[PDB]
Amino acid sequence: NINKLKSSIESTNEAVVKLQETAEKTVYVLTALQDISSQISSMNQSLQQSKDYIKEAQKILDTV
Amino acid sequence: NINKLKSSIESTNEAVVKLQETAEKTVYVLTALQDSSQISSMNQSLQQSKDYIKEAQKILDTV
Amino acid sequence: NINKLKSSIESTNEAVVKLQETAEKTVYVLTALVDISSQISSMNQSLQQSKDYIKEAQKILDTV
Q: Which domains does chain B show, CATH number per domain?
């Protein structure tokens, strides 16, 4: 149960890291608008991963 | 405390889902731009993220 | 351990708050397309802190 929480929290954290990775690409593209398409595809990749990680976190947490 | 932690985490995770939704719309607009309501939509989802995280901290304080 | 879980999640929540601050600056910039540069600069600062906070979260969590 304690282990249950830890494993779940870990997925939440990776989900957050994925959002941070996505947010840094945002800064790059916004800067630029003053390669972008490959940055956009990249954002999509890390965003889907964030979503994948959060669903896992939620799936686990439910087990508590 | 275990049940309180759980209840607190659920809000955190909801907060993250909202940011992801906010990031979805961000990607849309950026994609649109390199080829107003999307914006209104970002605000709604971001504010819910705030409410969720706020709630998470409140329950967390009871632990 | 519960004291530790609370400690790590605490940091996790801080990180989320910083991502929210970064998202707020993004909406502003997207709406401007104000002070894009300044705006894009706060985004970066906000994101960095978020990053610092998640790493502290991951660190504490490992103590569980």
A: 1-63 (1.10.287.770)
